[PDB]
Amino acid sequence: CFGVTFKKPLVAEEKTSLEPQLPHLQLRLPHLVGIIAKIKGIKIEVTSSGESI
Amino acid sequence: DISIMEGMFAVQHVHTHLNHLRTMLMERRIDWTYMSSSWLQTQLQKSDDEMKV
Numbered sequence: 001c002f003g004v005t006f007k008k009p010l011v012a013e014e015k016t017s018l019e020p021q022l023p024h025l026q027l028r029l030p031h032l033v034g035i036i037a038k039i040k041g042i043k044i045e046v047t048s049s050g051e052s053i
Numbered sequence: 054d055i056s057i058m059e060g061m062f063a064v065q066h067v068h069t070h071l072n073h074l075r076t077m078l079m080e081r082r083i084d085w086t087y088m089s090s091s092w093l094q095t096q097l098q099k100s101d102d103e104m105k106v
């Protein structure tokens with residue numbers, strides 16, 4: 001209109017959510033509980049010698 | 054203990070960025086790391102260099 005140009009109003013997103021990126025250390029000692037559980041049950045068997053004889 | 058100390062690093066990483074955001078907000082600026090700013094480049098058509106200003 002005349003010399004000036006008119007532009008439409010811009011709609012705005014109401015909310016934003018922040019989810020930052022985190023470094024991944026990738027440690028291996030955690031989630032190894034099964035090995036500890038296996039260590040718990042060694043179960044060495046010893047039979048008395050001389051009771052039979 | 055290692056399981057705890059692995060998760061503590063993420064807490065520290067979040068703490069640094071949150072402190073930076075607080076400084077920017079107290080400073081009457083905008084932290085563009087926490088905001089998208091990609092939707093308004095399409096609503097109003099501007100170049101990549103013009104969006105930096």
Ligand SMILES: *[C@@H]1O[C@H](CO)[C@@H](O[C@@H]2O[C@H](CO)[C@@H](O)[C@H](O)[C@H]2NC(C)=O)[C@H](O)[C@H]1NC(C)=O
Nearest residue numbers: 021022023024025026027031059060062063064
């Ligand atoms: C939290 O644990 C999950 C599951 O172990 C991790 O997600 C894995 O990440 C690796 C590395 O990018 C991918 O190869 C796997 O496919 C992912 N698995 C799943 C189920 O998503 C995640 O990385 C861990 N978070 C941190 C910060 O270490």
